Amino acid sequence: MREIVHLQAGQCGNQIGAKFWEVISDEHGIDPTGAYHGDSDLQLERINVYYNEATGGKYVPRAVLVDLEPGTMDSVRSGPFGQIFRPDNFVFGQSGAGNNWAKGHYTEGAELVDSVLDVVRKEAESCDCLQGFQLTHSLGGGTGSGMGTLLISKIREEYPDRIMNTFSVVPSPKVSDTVVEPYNATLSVHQLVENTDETYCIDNEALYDICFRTLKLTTPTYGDLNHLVSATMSGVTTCLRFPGQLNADLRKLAVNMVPFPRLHFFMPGFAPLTSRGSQQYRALTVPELTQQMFDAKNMMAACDPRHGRYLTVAAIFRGRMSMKEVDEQMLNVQNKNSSYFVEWIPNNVKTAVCDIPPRGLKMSATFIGNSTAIQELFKRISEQFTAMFRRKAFLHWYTGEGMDEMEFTEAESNMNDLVSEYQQYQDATA
């Protein structure tokens, strides 16, 4: 019950998703062949949240893998935990999008979206009680930015009441990996602000800092980054799967984290994160976990909360803990940093405590923060977008696929309005 259906997109989503399903399968005792060999029976009670059952103990993830190119999934199915997925769920075309939002959304993905929906509806209709849709993609690419937002609009129009949460990789400020990022980001964001309930903004540059600074990793592959993203995606959906002293459903977070309809962009975090040599110098207790959760150096988004104020916050703990400690620490954080929390919200923290921790850890915690400092990210993209758009830097690649320059102006105006709205609610009462 309260089933979640996972949607992929592009190379980023498919790579992140493949790691998410390896982590989830690990905490539920699911072998790469699909059989269950867990020890605790609790991990099997709510296994229906992500997995469908079959004969012989085989469990099939409720995942839909889609890309405009099959090279990425062929890697997915060939790699570990790739044979787990249902073959019919690999929906793909032949000609990929050239990192342009127009092709993925209007031309290339348009003719393939129907094939995906026919799999989504079939997956959704098998759920006793559908909780929501989970999408992993990237705003800087073409498939994820274009097709991922096309799917979002299609599903929202078909399942208006269900919760839709997106874990989107955002372009980094320091260095880019695609020359047309401002166009893909601006156009993709124009869709997200209207057709999703809670977007978890992350960027690789921030995860590079975490691996370099905290984990002291000298050879951080994309597998290491994707594991970090996987852990936070597992954290926000643990109450649905395990019991605890205080539960938090996805809609429970959205209600507590989204004051206004359009301010639904979150910057996640995780704890504990320690190197292999620094593990023997740590207490591993609630007071320190809460300390690094709010540390700006331990957040998976570029924007620093110190530059703005927290509208709201969520702290989904895991492992058996003293509820007294948890509340005292959250209150302690609230008192010290009273300047960092918006004042017209008397309480800015939503708490939850799951009983079962991730494998190999006695304790854990996932941080979710809706901060007005996120306005920096969108404002930075606006500056890049308007720079290129001022002299038709690359439009012909977009307008030739069916787009129009008017849509470019509308997307920029909408993003600027959102930045204005985030700034407006950063000021105190009256």
Partner: protein, 432 residues
């Protein structure tokens, strides 16, 4: 003969209920099942069957199905009747509107039927015990929905509710002020007496008096379990001066809209430091009036008492009770309102409180539970209304509530009603 129907709503009520029914089963020799080993007053809470199985007279209801699903897998899986445990599709998501208008409508007709099948099975109906959270979700909407349904089907029957009132500083949800006011507005006219407790207040007690730096929710519930046992001990056991659930309504509620007593339980003492305490009647009676021992973080001396119920247990002499109350009446710091010269209702029971194995409380000889109605709680309502006013002024989270069956106006009506109640508490506290 006597009976009490226990309705447990939400995660708080269900988890509080787990402690209550672990205590009751222990107070009656029950063996974690309906069986009693090879023990006669249980009839007030436990229905009996020819098999020798005793069935708790309680209803567990939740829109979420994780907490109740844990009971069905717990040690008390074979105690409750499976149809008593009612679970829904999707929780209320900290939203009052979902609990009251959209999801509650699909379960209320089911829980109310099981209540009916219990009400008609009682030789005589005495009242209802409601356990729920004030933070929100099921506890705020479903309860106010259920309370209105019980008020019509059963009319004048007593309806007592145990609420986990929001703490002043500590908070676990961001929209508590919305849920707290909305449920209160819809429960003032349908509730008889609401006993308040705060997580923060019990957190202070659990470390300040019990020597524990790591209280879980199990510890708080076990403390609340003792209180309810004391309140219902008169029905369950014999005593010198008994008290019935219908007596609280008149003794504690001077006016229909002012029915929010505090709660206290004096001998909350660690086992080790109990060896250095006499634990005599006069001292424990005085502890009840100390701000350091209240189970709600509201200071009594900030206001005036209006009614007090002292429910003693164990080895207690009514002469000592007379003396201790007489001295307390003498103290000037302990101020009672002038229009209530008769300030105390007293109840004495012969059954000492029982200690749960693995618990924290000491094996006390005598104990007292105090239920006091004070004007000091007016401060808490004012604080709560201020938080609501801040959020609502900005319409901080309104769109969630309006879009799930509620309406914009109800926010204004609920708040103004709370303003009237706060005004009423002021009028009651002034004379001439």
């Amino acid at each position: 003969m006597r009976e009490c129907i226990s309705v447990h709503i939400g995660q708080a009520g269900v988890q509080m209920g787990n402690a209550c029914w672990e205590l009751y089963c222990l107070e009656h020799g029950i063996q974690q099942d309906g069986i009693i080993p090879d023990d006669s007053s249980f009839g007030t809470f436990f229905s009996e069957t020819g098999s020798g199985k005793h069935v708790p007279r309680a209803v567990f209801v939740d829109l979420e199905q994780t907490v109740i699903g844990e009971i069905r897998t717990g040690h008390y899986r074979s105690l409750f009747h499976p149809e008593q445990l009612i679970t829904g599709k999707e929780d209320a998501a900290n939203n009052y509107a979902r609990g009251h208008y959209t999801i509650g409508k699909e379960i209320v007709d089911s829980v109310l039927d099981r209540v009916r099948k219990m009400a008609d099975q009682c030789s005589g109906l005495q009242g209802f015990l409601i356990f729920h959270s004030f933070g929100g979700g099921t506890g705020s909407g479903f309860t106010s929905l259920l309370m209105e349904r019980l008020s019509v089907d059963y009319g004048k029957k007593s309806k007592l509710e145990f609420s986990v009132y929001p703490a002043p500083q500590i908070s676990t949800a961001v929209v508590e002020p919305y849920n707290s006011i909305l449920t209160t507005h819809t429960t003032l006219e349908h509730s008889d007496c609401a006993f308040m407790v705060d997580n923060e207040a019990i957190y202070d007690i659990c470390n300040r008096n019990l020597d524990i730096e790591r209280p879980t929710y199990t510890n708080l519930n076990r403390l609340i379990g003792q209180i309810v046992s004391s309140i219902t001990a008169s029905l369950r056991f014999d005593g010198a001066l008994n008290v019935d659930l219908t007596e609280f309504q008149t003794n504690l509620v001077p006016y229909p809209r002012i029915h929010f007593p505090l709660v206290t339980y004096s001998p909350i003492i660690s086992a080790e430091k109990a060896y250095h305490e006499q634990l005599s009647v006069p001292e424990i009676t005085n502890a009840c009036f100390e701000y350091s021992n209240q189970m709600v973080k509201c200071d009594p001396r900030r206001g005036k008492y209006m009614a007090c119920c002292l429910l003693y247990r164990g080895d207690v002499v009514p002469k000592d009770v007379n003396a201790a109350i007489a001295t307390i009446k003498t103290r000037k710091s302990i101020q009672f309102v002038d229009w209530c010269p008769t300030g105390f209702k007293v109840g004495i029971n012969y059954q000492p409180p029982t200690a749960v194995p693995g618990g924290d409380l000491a094996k006390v000889q005598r104990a007292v539970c105090m239920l006091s109605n004070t004007t000091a709680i007016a401060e808490a309502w004012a604080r709560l209304d201020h938080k609501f006013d801040l959020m609502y002024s900005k319409r901080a989270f309104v769109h969630w509530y309006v879009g799930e069956g509620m309406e914009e106006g109800e926010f204004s009506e609920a708040r103004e009603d709370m303003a009237a109640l706060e005004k009423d508490y002021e009028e009651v506290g002034t004379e001439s």
